[PDB]
Amino acid sequence: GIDLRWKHVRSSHRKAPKSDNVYLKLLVKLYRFLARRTEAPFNKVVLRRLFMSRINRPPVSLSRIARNLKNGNEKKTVVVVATVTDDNRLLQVPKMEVAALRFTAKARARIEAAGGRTLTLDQLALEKPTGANTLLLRGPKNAREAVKHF
Amino acid sequence: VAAKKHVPIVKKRTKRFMRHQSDRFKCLDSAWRKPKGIDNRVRRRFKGNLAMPSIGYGSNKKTKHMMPSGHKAFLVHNVKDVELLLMHNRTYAAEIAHNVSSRKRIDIITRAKQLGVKVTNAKAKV
Amino acid sequence: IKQLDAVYESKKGFFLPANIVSQADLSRLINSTEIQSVLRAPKGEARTKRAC
Amino acid sequence: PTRFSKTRKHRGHVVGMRHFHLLRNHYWRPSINIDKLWSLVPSDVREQYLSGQKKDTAPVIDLLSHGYAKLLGKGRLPEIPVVVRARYVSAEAERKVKEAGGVVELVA
Amino acid sequence: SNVSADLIWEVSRNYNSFLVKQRTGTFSRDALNLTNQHSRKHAGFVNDKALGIVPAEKGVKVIAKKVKAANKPASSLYTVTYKSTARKAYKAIASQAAKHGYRADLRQAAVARASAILRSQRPVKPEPPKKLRGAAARR
Amino acid sequence: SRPTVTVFGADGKPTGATEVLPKVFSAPIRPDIVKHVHTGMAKNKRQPYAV
RNA sequence: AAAGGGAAGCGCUUGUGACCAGACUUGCGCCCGGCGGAUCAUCCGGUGUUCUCACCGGUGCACUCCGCCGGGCUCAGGCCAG
RNA sequence: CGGGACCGAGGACCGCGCUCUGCAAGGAUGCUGGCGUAAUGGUCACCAGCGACCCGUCUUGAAACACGGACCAAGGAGUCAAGGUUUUGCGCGAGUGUUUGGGUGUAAAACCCGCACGCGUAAUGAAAGUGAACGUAGGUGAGAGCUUCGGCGCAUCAUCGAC
């Protein structure tokens, strides 16, 4: 016998999505290839967040994007691996280039009306395969009723 | 035709795993049941008792589901079923299903002879 | 087939959904010049020789 | 569905004051902050006003038609004169509307 | 677009009407499936470029997918019958499988399938009689 | 431009007429959504039983 | 058919008796000889294609292809062993 | 330098080497004999050597006691509803929910419609009532990622401020 005071630890992170979305499966295959064949940490972060569940992908609004676009970030490509929502409190949308998992209809319309560009994550992989000149944004994770009641 | 060359087929255990006390009770089938009593000698693995099945008895991955000739059985119901084994005559043999009539068995056996596919139960209904 | 577009225009509260993927051809995406020109060189093959 | 349950796996192993006759309709006064005030304007007219193609007109907003009785004052307004008709208004909301160049009209 | 060979494989990889699943393996009834095995490489109906071989009365009949007629099933198959020497059939099949970059990974399987069909078209030899063995069978 | 689809006559031959393909044919193909909705929908004609 | 000197039953392993499943029966390839046929190579036309590859009709005039039958040879073939 | 035992995983080449025409160097080949069938192998019955208490159940710390079991077949015990809560998948998203109802129908299906309403979008107070920007929605220290290599800094945490 071998005395094992310590225990070998099985993985406590997602290795694959629980979702059955076929397009998400194709995106996961593409970003698995990118994370394997590139040095860019952006690709690994994007792959890991593609694995994530919905409460771990809180929505990001246009006002949050506009806040993070200030101070030299106006020309960077905004990357969100959640839903980009519209904020009607923001009356003037700045010109921006946003790549997201999905957009609401009003957010897409307001970005295109302000003159920015809307992309999917496979288009982001085509144009910035190393994540160059990107601004990676996450939504407020703790802004949930369950988290308030914890 | 002869099977594809393979490593020797080793069975770690050929005897079945008999259920405890099914030799003494006729209402107990011999099919294996794990004893869940806290004081059971088979469950506690006292020596001289029945063995318990476990994953250590598992067969070699290269020879799993191989019959002694080296083929893997594939159940067939008709000629179109047996024609799926056209590219696999060195690895797969055809087992005609039990509810196939004698004439259809004759047709299946003739087609499998043309394809060079071994039939495991070719002598039946003759 | 003429009336189908008006049928889907008349459904109020519903729009045809946007996909999360713009190009479904994964082979075209992976073997495009844009991705392949920035990749690291391969670190191995599909089959690995047994060392010892 | 019954085939997904754990039982199938476990088979084999088992103050203040009282208010009599309260009428909630007496206390109906929904509130909207001033940062949502321009969202009540229809979208094309709102974009014209925010772009600046309407320099001679002011929007008149009836909060009771949209289902609001009180104008609260969270947020900020653009520098556009707006006439707001409301049953109630907070002091800060009136102050911000007056800075924006409009007026708060009291209605019933 | 919304449709690709990868998308069709994700849709039909767990179940389709050509699937034959048993304990010892998963087979496919697809006419464009050389080796009759369920995989993305051999899923001919899934793939944009694909080859299939069927027996003729004498020789083989090879079908290939036309890429510009994928929405026209009546005119989507390029069909050639080889009823000649086996070497000529193998040469032509390898030519349409490898010379112009049309599924070069399938040329071994295609030549092997043509060889199997032509071999099956030979006359069968009579089997030796069954030898009775032991005591009860022999007597 | 948008793709077209051929129109066939009663004899099975093209009539020379084409139609613009409707936009719904470019919608995403989502078997998980289809299976969820079908599982819900197939239960809606059920008649109750009880002892 | 068998066992039985105050229980039987069961586990590991031989043995005896009885009863059985496979495997094997030959394959592929060269060199000769004898048959039976020209869907041998090239060229021409038509058609289809993956646009350079094929199919069909004419040309083979038998040192070329394709089957069959007799010999010979190499290799690979089942079980247990030295 | 002898004598003996057990084993032969892998399956084109690639490597480290050496005594370098080649080798004992990233895992067994070569030669030969008998037999080609119940001979090997397997199943069943029995003898032989060794091994081996009758199963739940209860109790406590555990045994013992106690209780159930003559045998076989068939039933035979964590279910449904309402309301919460956390997590997973999906749709839409500052909104969301067609199905009380109406329209329609190939008629308990499917399809379509909308007023109200529910929940959410604002809280606090017993109540009358009042009601959320000094600041690029603040400062400081961390912080993935990005960077024009000066910095910008997500989520989140700690602390000081503002309403």
mmCIF file of N, CA and C in Angstrom, chain F residues 6-51:
data_model
loop_
_atom_site.group_PDB
_atom_site.id
_atom_site.type_symbol
_atom_site.label_atom_id
_atom_site.label_comp_id
_atom_site.label_asym_id
_atom_site.label_seq_id
_atom_site.Cartn_x
_atom_site.Cartn_y
_atom_site.Cartn_z
ATOM 1 N N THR F 6 -36.823 27.355 -59.411
ATOM 2 C CA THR F 6 -37.518 27.065 -60.657
ATOM 3 C C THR F 6 -38.946 26.605 -60.378
ATOM 4 N N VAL F 7 -39.875 26.988 -61.254
ATOM 5 C CA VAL F 7 -41.262 26.546 -61.173
ATOM 6 C C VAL F 7 -41.483 25.462 -62.216
ATOM 7 N N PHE F 8 -42.085 24.353 -61.798
ATOM 8 C CA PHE F 8 -42.348 23.224 -62.674
ATOM 9 C C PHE F 8 -43.841 23.107 -62.952
ATOM 10 N N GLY F 9 -44.169 22.655 -64.160
ATOM 11 C CA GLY F 9 -45.544 22.520 -64.588
ATOM 12 C C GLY F 9 -46.129 21.161 -64.258
ATOM 13 N N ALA F 10 -47.353 20.946 -64.748
ATOM 14 C CA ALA F 10 -48.072 19.705 -64.481
ATOM 15 C C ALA F 10 -47.434 18.497 -65.152
ATOM 16 N N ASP F 11 -46.663 18.700 -66.218
ATOM 17 C CA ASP F 11 -45.956 17.608 -66.869
ATOM 18 C C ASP F 11 -44.609 17.295 -66.228
ATOM 19 N N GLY F 12 -44.175 18.086 -65.250
ATOM 20 C CA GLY F 12 -42.912 17.859 -64.583
ATOM 21 C C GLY F 12 -41.730 18.603 -65.159
ATOM 22 N N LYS F 13 -41.944 19.455 -66.155
ATOM 23 C CA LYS F 13 -40.895 20.246 -66.775
ATOM 24 C C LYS F 13 -40.944 21.683 -66.269
ATOM 25 N N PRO F 14 -39.809 22.387 -66.273
ATOM 26 C CA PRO F 14 -39.824 23.809 -65.911
ATOM 27 C C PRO F 14 -40.682 24.629 -66.865
ATOM 28 N N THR F 15 -41.400 25.595 -66.300
ATOM 29 C CA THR F 15 -42.259 26.479 -67.074
ATOM 30 C C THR F 15 -41.525 27.695 -67.615
ATOM 31 N N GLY F 16 -40.256 27.874 -67.262
ATOM 32 C CA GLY F 16 -39.544 29.093 -67.563
ATOM 33 C C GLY F 16 -39.700 30.180 -66.526
ATOM 34 N N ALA F 17 -40.470 29.936 -65.472
ATOM 35 C CA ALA F 17 -40.701 30.909 -64.418
ATOM 36 C C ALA F 17 -39.849 30.591 -63.196
ATOM 37 N N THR F 18 -39.387 31.647 -62.535
ATOM 38 C CA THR F 18 -38.606 31.532 -61.315
ATOM 39 C C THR F 18 -39.253 32.378 -60.230
ATOM 40 N N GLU F 19 -38.977 32.009 -58.986
ATOM 41 C CA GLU F 19 -39.466 32.735 -57.828
ATOM 42 C C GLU F 19 -38.295 33.096 -56.930
ATOM 43 N N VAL F 20 -38.405 34.232 -56.246
ATOM 44 C CA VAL F 20 -37.393 34.591 -55.264
ATOM 45 C C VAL F 20 -37.544 33.692 -54.045
ATOM 46 N N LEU F 21 -36.430 33.140 -53.576
ATOM 47 C CA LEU F 21 -36.468 32.265 -52.412
ATOM 48 C C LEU F 21 -36.809 33.078 -51.169
ATOM 49 N N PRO F 22 -37.813 32.671 -50.395
ATOM 50 C CA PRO F 22 -38.166 33.410 -49.180
ATOM 51 C C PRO F 22 -37.055 33.371 -48.141
ATOM 52 N N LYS F 23 -37.034 34.417 -47.311
ATOM 53 C CA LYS F 23 -35.968 34.604 -46.333
ATOM 54 C C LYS F 23 -35.990 33.567 -45.217
ATOM 55 N N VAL F 24 -37.118 32.882 -45.009
ATOM 56 C CA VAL F 24 -37.205 31.885 -43.948
ATOM 57 C C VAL F 24 -36.354 30.654 -44.253
ATOM 58 N N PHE F 25 -35.995 30.430 -45.518
ATOM 59 C CA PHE F 25 -35.160 29.286 -45.859
ATOM 60 C C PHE F 25 -33.699 29.491 -45.478
ATOM 61 N N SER F 26 -33.316 30.699 -45.072
ATOM 62 C CA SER F 26 -31.984 30.981 -44.561
ATOM 63 C C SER F 26 -31.945 31.060 -43.038
ATOM 64 N N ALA F 27 -33.025 30.664 -42.366
ATOM 65 C CA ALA F 27 -33.062 30.675 -40.913
ATOM 66 C C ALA F 27 -32.121 29.609 -40.351
ATOM 67 N N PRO F 28 -31.597 29.813 -39.138
ATOM 68 C CA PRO F 28 -30.745 28.784 -38.525
ATOM 69 C C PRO F 28 -31.508 27.491 -38.280
ATOM 70 N N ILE F 29 -30.815 26.376 -38.469
ATOM 71 C CA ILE F 29 -31.376 25.048 -38.262
ATOM 72 C C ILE F 29 -30.967 24.605 -36.865
ATOM 73 N N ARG F 30 -31.935 24.555 -35.947
ATOM 74 C CA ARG F 30 -31.676 24.345 -34.522
ATOM 75 C C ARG F 30 -32.435 23.118 -34.034
ATOM 76 N N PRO F 31 -31.811 21.937 -34.090
ATOM 77 C CA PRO F 31 -32.495 20.711 -33.649
ATOM 78 C C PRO F 31 -32.848 20.689 -32.172
ATOM 79 N N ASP F 32 -32.082 21.360 -31.308
ATOM 80 C CA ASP F 32 -32.429 21.384 -29.889
ATOM 81 C C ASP F 32 -33.719 22.162 -29.641
ATOM 82 N N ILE F 33 -33.863 23.323 -30.289
ATOM 83 C CA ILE F 33 -35.097 24.100 -30.194
ATOM 84 C C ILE F 33 -36.256 23.322 -30.796
ATOM 85 N N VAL F 34 -36.017 22.680 -31.946
ATOM 86 C CA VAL F 34 -37.054 21.894 -32.609
ATOM 87 C C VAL F 34 -37.511 20.741 -31.721
ATOM 88 N N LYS F 35 -36.567 20.056 -31.070
ATOM 89 C CA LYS F 35 -36.908 18.926 -30.212
ATOM 90 C C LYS F 35 -37.660 19.373 -28.966
ATOM 91 N N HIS F 36 -37.245 20.491 -28.359
ATOM 92 C CA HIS F 36 -37.952 21.018 -27.193
ATOM 93 C C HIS F 36 -39.393 21.388 -27.538
ATOM 94 N N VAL F 37 -39.581 22.106 -28.648
ATOM 95 C CA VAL F 37 -40.922 22.537 -29.030
ATOM 96 C C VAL F 37 -41.775 21.340 -29.445
ATOM 97 N N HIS F 38 -41.181 20.355 -30.128
ATOM 98 C CA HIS F 38 -41.939 19.172 -30.533
ATOM 99 C C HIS F 38 -42.342 18.324 -29.332
ATOM 100 N N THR F 39 -41.445 18.183 -28.349
ATOM 101 C CA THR F 39 -41.768 17.456 -27.126
ATOM 102 C C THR F 39 -42.912 18.130 -26.380
ATOM 103 N N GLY F 40 -42.906 19.464 -26.330
ATOM 104 C CA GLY F 40 -44.038 20.163 -25.740
ATOM 105 C C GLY F 40 -45.318 20.006 -26.545
ATOM 106 N N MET F 41 -45.215 20.127 -27.871
ATOM 107 C CA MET F 41 -46.392 20.246 -28.727
ATOM 108 C C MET F 41 -47.112 18.914 -28.894
ATOM 109 N N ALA F 42 -46.369 17.803 -28.929
ATOM 110 C CA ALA F 42 -46.987 16.498 -29.135
ATOM 111 C C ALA F 42 -47.836 16.041 -27.955
ATOM 112 N N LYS F 43 -47.727 16.699 -26.804
ATOM 113 C CA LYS F 43 -48.521 16.367 -25.631
ATOM 114 C C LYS F 43 -49.854 17.099 -25.581
ATOM 115 N N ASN F 44 -50.107 18.024 -26.503
ATOM 116 C CA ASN F 44 -51.213 18.961 -26.361
ATOM 117 C C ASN F 44 -52.549 18.419 -26.853
ATOM 118 N N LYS F 45 -52.567 17.267 -27.516
ATOM 119 C CA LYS F 45 -53.810 16.625 -27.920
ATOM 120 C C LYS F 45 -54.181 15.458 -27.014
ATOM 121 N N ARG F 46 -53.502 15.307 -25.881
ATOM 122 C CA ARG F 46 -53.724 14.151 -25.027
ATOM 123 C C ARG F 46 -55.045 14.257 -24.274
ATOM 124 N N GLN F 47 -55.766 13.142 -24.213
ATOM 125 C CA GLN F 47 -56.962 13.004 -23.394
ATOM 126 C C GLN F 47 -56.596 12.399 -22.042
ATOM 127 N N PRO F 48 -57.176 12.902 -20.958
ATOM 128 C CA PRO F 48 -56.810 12.401 -19.629
ATOM 129 C C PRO F 48 -57.344 11.005 -19.360
ATOM 130 N N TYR F 49 -56.611 10.274 -18.524
ATOM 131 C CA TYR F 49 -57.037 8.978 -18.023
ATOM 132 C C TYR F 49 -56.883 8.957 -16.511
ATOM 133 N N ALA F 50 -57.740 8.182 -15.852
ATOM 134 C CA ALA F 50 -57.649 7.979 -14.414
ATOM 135 C C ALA F 50 -58.430 6.731 -14.042
ATOM 136 N N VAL F 51 -58.012 6.090 -12.956
ATOM 137 C CA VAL F 51 -58.832 5.048 -12.358
ATOM 138 C C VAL F 51 -59.969 5.695 -11.575
#
